[PDB]
Design an enzyme around this catalytic site. Sequence first.
Site, PDB file in Angstrom:
ATOM      1  N   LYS A 164      45.782  44.528  35.271  1.00 41.38           N
ATOM      2  CA  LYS A 164      46.508  45.891  33.718  1.00 41.38           C
ATOM      3  C   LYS A 164      45.188  46.150  33.963  1.00 41.38           C
ATOM      4  O   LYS A 164      45.247  47.086  33.065  1.00 41.38           O
ATOM      5  CB  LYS A 164      47.842  45.140  33.827  1.00 41.38           C
ATOM      6  CG  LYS A 164      49.183  44.557  34.597  1.00 41.38           C
ATOM      7  CD  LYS A 164      49.034  45.918  35.384  1.00 41.38           C
ATOM      8  CE  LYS A 164      50.798  45.785  35.927  1.00 41.38           C
ATOM      9  NZ  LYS A 164      51.446  44.028  35.652  1.00 41.38           N
ATOM     10  N   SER A 218      52.912  35.563  40.690  1.00 41.99           N
ATOM     11  CA  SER A 218      53.302  36.679  41.306  1.00 41.99           C
ATOM     12  C   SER A 218      51.862  35.784  42.849  1.00 41.99           C
ATOM     13  O   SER A 218      52.086  36.949  43.751  1.00 41.99           O
ATOM     14  CB  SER A 218      53.358  37.695  41.249  1.00 41.99           C
ATOM     15  OG  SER A 218      51.481  37.848  40.253  1.00 41.99           O
TER      16      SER A 218
END
Lengths: 336, 337
Positions: free
Chosen positions: A57, A279
């Site tokens: 991010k 993830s």
Amino acid sequence: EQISISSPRKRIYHNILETIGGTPLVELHGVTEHPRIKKGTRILVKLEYFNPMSSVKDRVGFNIVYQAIKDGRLKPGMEIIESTSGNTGIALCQAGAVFGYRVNIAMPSTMSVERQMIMKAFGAELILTEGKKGMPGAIEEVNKMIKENPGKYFVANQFGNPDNTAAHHYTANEIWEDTDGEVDIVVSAVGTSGTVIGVAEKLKEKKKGIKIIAVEPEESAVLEGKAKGPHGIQGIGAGFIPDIYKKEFVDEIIPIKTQDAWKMARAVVKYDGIMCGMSSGAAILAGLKEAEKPENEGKTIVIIVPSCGERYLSTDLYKIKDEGTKIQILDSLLNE
Amino acid sequence: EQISISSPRKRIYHNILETIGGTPLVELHGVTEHPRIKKGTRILVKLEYFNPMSSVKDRVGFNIVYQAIKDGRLKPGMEIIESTSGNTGIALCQAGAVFGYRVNIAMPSTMSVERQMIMKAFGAELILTEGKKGMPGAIEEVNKMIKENPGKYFVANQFGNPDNTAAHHYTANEIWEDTDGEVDIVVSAVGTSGTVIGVAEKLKEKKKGIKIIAVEPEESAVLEGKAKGPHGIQGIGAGFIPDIYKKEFVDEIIPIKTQDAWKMARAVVKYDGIMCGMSSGAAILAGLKEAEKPENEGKTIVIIVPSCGERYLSTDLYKIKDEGTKIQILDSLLNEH
């Protein structure tokens, strides 16, 4: 058998935001030790925790904020705001600290309390909302704040902002250059979808027919038309189709059970020495499942790894022990 | 300005160890804005948390294990062992995982349980010793284990292993190439001293006049010949002079108070957006103190940043809150006569 560490960057970076991106592409060997995975098939992981705040991010916070400033959407006297309990708030905090903009992050007082402290270290104002209200209660409060103070706030809007998706044109360029145009398949676990779509857009511009695979939790398979449900893969399975998602660019969607994602991530750090987050465990298992298909022999498969296991030490990720030999563990992951 | 992100590496790494080193050198701006620092002096930080396990020790665990494999000190059948409750243990686990050797790490049962978890994930065997015993307890157990199992273990021996110091010849070459030879001063907070000595050895070959500054805690100023003492700057201030330390290579030693090191690290993350750890707060404050010396006007000062603040979330680093504006904070950090 010779091992060469990395050479000098030969650059002096003007600030931390210039160290974003250019993340390393690393071969997997330990977890690919399968008779059914042919030796010419290459399985590579792109490690986005090499970013300055250790997640994918970083690229998103940077691009959203920098483009807003260049756009005149974020101007002096305004403040950044964004409801998020994840890595996006950390990345927005990093960009705001560099650019000199106050950052407001709203999240349930319930959530990521380590992440609360990270965000406050950066000088963020936290907006802690009612726990039993979850993220809807955080979004609610942001809206109330905008309405009570028009003109004051820039909303990052990570699920609807195309500056998210656009940041991953660099991610794409890196995969293309690092593989010397040999990439065949890219696997990305989906949260906002900025990575899967931004990578797809840009790679398909380079080579149509690169295969793009989205990964989501079996327990919350919304991209595959199932309902939002409870799951344990942090960072993905948002429970809705993001407004930035473009289905035309995704070739296949692979659902991964929460427990299997965690068990894969445990095997990757054990057998390859790569400490990936939950993830990533999902993306990598989907990638290994591709790598064992006969049609894919000799192909180059690139798997995005969005975060490092260190950010998950207060979770259940490492607390479950696994029985068996390596080959047993991998067989149990690939089977049924 | 135009802000540009990093370019593709144009490399496919054969394993995670090849991603160690080549860490970025970043300018400081926010925390350098004080009237006693001149516009021309360049203050740069080398961010060793860009290593795959987020600290400088990645270089050290790698080169210790690698060189021992190349030498024949580590051979199939043996296991690695090391008494440590810092980053060296993590770096040894990562190297051990890739090379396929078992790693045994000894530490007090009560110390860095976040780090214990990290280590177990890599498959390490943890040797947890009596809490009250402290470090000495862990070293004593390691000693008992090697005594009873002659030949089975390779001891990393971080404070006395020249492969620690030698790894930093690469750190030095990166400083040299990244600055295009313009580096004038290197500031390194000292734990094992592999970094400050290994950098000094190689840079002092390149050009005369590069000043090498070691940093240690005020409350345990053992390199300066003071007595050991309790301090809160994690990763430095071992309490003894390491066997790999070579005083000839160090020009100056700067003591830094624990609370000052923490406050510096808080200021670096808030005003430069760089989340450095405690020992980095110490090194950076010492580096700013150099940057205010008139003799240092226009020089290039390179400060080692060994670790990231996220490894410190359970300490008091960020609990303490500093009131006041940026200039009050910087002016209070540079206060002393």
